[PDB]
Design a protein around this ligand. Structure first.
Ligand SMILES: [Mg+2]
Ligand SMILES: [Mg+2]
Ligand SMILES: [Mg+2]
Ligand SMILES: [Mg+2]
Ligand SMILES: [Mg+2]
Ligand SMILES: [Mg+2]
Ligand SMILES: [Mg+2]
Ligand SMILES: [Mg+2]
Ligand SMILES: [Mg+2]
Ligand SMILES: [Mg+2]
Ligand SMILES: [Mg+2]
Ligand SMILES: [Mg+2]
Ligand SMILES: [Mg+2]
Ligand SMILES: [Mg+2]
Ligand SMILES: [Mg+2]
Ligand SMILES: [Mg+2]
Ligand SMILES: [Mg+2]
Ligand SMILES: [Mg+2]
Ligand SMILES: [Mg+2]
Ligand SMILES: [Mg+2]
Ligand SMILES: [Mg+2]
Ligand SMILES: [Mg+2]
Ligand SMILES: [Mg+2]
Ligand SMILES: [Mg+2]
Ligand SMILES: [Mg+2]
Ligand SMILES: [Mg+2]
Ligand SMILES: [Mg+2]
Lengths: 152, 62, 119
RNA sequence: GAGUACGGUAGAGGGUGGUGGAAUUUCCUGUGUAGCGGUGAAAUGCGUAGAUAUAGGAAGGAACACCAGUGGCGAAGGCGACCACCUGGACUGAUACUGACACUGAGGUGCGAAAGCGUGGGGAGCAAACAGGAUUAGAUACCCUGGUAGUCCACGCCGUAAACGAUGUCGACUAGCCGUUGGGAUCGAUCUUAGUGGCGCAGCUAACGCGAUAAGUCGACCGCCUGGGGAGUACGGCCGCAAGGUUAAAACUCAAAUGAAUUGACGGGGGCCCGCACAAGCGGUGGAGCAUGUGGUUUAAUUCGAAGCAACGCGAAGA
């Protein structure tokens, strides 16, 4: 806004993992106020993650999150005849939000049985750089570095 | 307009010194002037306006 | 394909409002390597930026390391961007810049220039 | 008052020749390899028949960076490289000299930007006309790549410009302050003289504004105006090689056309500020089926009203 008066809220209460980031992830997967359904979905996905193998499910979670947050972002700007696209570094807070939004949106459209299974598959595949989200990140990165001329 | 690198200084003062020397010489101004043709009416008008502004600038000091 | 060594080159930066051309020669004006902003693959509005000039100078310098050329003198000419980023690319290529000179041609009266654009 | 003789100053004042340095273009040669040029984005165009770049050389033409300045000179138009020659005027100081020899000026005579015209040269750049590429609904334009008359020189004609300070020439008086150009005197300062600028008291003006460079106070002479169109046009005359110039009406038509300033509104003018106005996000409508209001069509009747935002689940919280 113009006034620059927005103040950020503090509601962050991970119940049984005590991990600050998973509460925000569950807020992202929540639809229409149904906290419990999203709660169950995320916990089921993490159970699948912990039973596929020996990796700590939470640790796999932040490893995927690190391997999916973009470093630079492209911003459009019309210069009087053409709309160019400058690169700019992404703020530390925006990285995780973009990562979660992309991860959830791409897990939405996979096509397995239940949403928890979709999320688990996305976390397993993106934990090494093979998911749709990771290639979207690569597309954004190459698009940003192909416009390095403006940058500043 | 020319410079030299003398007695082992970084290539960050020599370049800036060269820029200052070129600005003092008046290279970009000369090129921008000969970029297109300015008819004598426009030249005389510009000189008159600049003189008026210079005189106002001098007078307003007191 | 035959070899020839040469030391103490001269690099000419030719900067216009649309492009930049970097040419490394010997003392006698014999060009060894050259590069351009358009040749680097920019091709348009991106061609008139100091980044394109820096990349062009990098390519030209890397080409010129073949012959040796431990030392370069510099001749800048033109009003456009890429005027200074080319030089600071050239040193980072590894050469020892002895001096920089501006050789922009200035008429004293000369021919009359084109008419003014009505934009 | 107006002129003459004598030293002395400053100046892109004018004419005739000679010569310089920077840069562009073309041409010859060496190196060198895939682009160059241009644009808001492109494309036309130029390149592997070796371009652009870079170095050496040659030819030619035109304009004269810095100095450069509310600076200078000239009746005006106008005049910027350097040197020699021919030549006009202005400013300045002392002494002497003539003795009203003056001012203005209808006819008349002469100079007069640029474009244009005639004859003969020249040809670098720029560029009407013209060609192609874009843009566009179209684009005989703006924009891009080319490009001929012309721009340059000699002689001759043309005789017009927002040829403007939109202010005729000459002379005399009327508070001041601050710069600057050429030059004298007095002790850096003061005085004085001919220019060139910024403010400003009286006074003047419809107002804006002028204000010793008057648009103030006066005198001498000249040119011109008499509502807006038609029209600076037609016809006649005179000039011109032509383009055209100059002098210059009427019928008819209207009741206005106009100048300066004031309040608002508007601007693809400027500066500050704001609002789910953008930006960053979440959920939708437009597709399907149904409910409901409206338009249109139909009917004996489909009862009246609401119509951009600010009408259409609205009057109607019940056909
Ligand atoms: Mg041009
Ligand atoms: Mg060449
Ligand atoms: Mg007369
Ligand atoms: Mg002429
Ligand atoms: Mg002619
Ligand atoms: Mg003709
Ligand atoms: Mg001829
Ligand atoms: Mg041309
Ligand atoms: Mg002629
Ligand atoms: Mg007239
Ligand atoms: Mg005039
Ligand atoms: Mg008049
Ligand atoms: Mg008068
Ligand atoms: Mg008088
Ligand atoms: Mg005044
Ligand atoms: Mg009056
Ligand atoms: Mg009349
Ligand atoms: Mg006539
Ligand atoms: Mg006429
Ligand atoms: Mg006649
Ligand atoms: Mg003729
Ligand atoms: Mg008015
Ligand atoms: Mg938005
Ligand atoms: Mg529909
Ligand atoms: Mg529908
Ligand atoms: Mg009704
Ligand atoms: Mg409603």
């Amino acid at each position: 806004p113009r006034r620059r008066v927005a103040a950020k809220r503090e509601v962050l209460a991970d119940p049984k993992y005590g991990s600050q980031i998973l509460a925000k992830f569950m807020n992202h997967v929540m639809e229409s106020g149904k906290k419990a359904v999203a709660e169950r979905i995320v916990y089921g996905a993490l159970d699948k993650v912990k039973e596929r193998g020996k990796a700590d499910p939470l640790e796999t979670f932040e490893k995927a999150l690190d391997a999916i947050a973009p470093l630079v972002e492209v911003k459009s700007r019309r210069v009087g005849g053409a709309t160019y696209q400058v690169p700019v570094e992404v703020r530390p807070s925006r990285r995780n939000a973009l990562a979660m939004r992309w991860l959830v949106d791409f897990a939405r459209k996979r096509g397995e049985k239940s949403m928890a299974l979709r999320l688990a598959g996305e976390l397993l595949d993106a934990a090494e750089g093979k998911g749709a989200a990771v290639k979207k990140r690569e597309d954004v990165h190459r698009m940003a570095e192909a416009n390095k001329a403006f940058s500043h | 307009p020319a410079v030299k690198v003398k007695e082992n200084e970084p290539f960050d003062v020599a370049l800036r010194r060269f820029k200052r020397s070129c600005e003092k010489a008046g290279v970009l101004a000369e090129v921008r002037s000969r970029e297109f043709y300015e008819k004598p009416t426009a030249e005389r008008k510009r000189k008159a306006a600049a003189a008026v502004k210079r005189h106002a600038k001098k007078v307003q000091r007191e | 394909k035959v070899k020839k060594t040469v030391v103490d080159g001269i690099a000419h930066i030719h900067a216009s409002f649309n492009n930049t051309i970097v040419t490394i020669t010997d003392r006698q004006g014999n060009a060894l390597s050259w590069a351009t902003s358009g040749g680097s693959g920019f091709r348009g509005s991106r061609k008139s930026t100091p980044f394109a000039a820096q990349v062009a100078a990098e390519r030209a310098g890397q080409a010129a390391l073949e012959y040796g050329l431990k030392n370069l003198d510099v001749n800048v000419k033109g009003p456009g961007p890429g005027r200074e980023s080319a030089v600071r690319a050239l040193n980072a290529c590894g050469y020892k810049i002895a001096s920089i000179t501006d050789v922009t041609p200035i008429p004293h009266n000369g021919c009359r220039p084109p008419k003014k654009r009505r934009v």
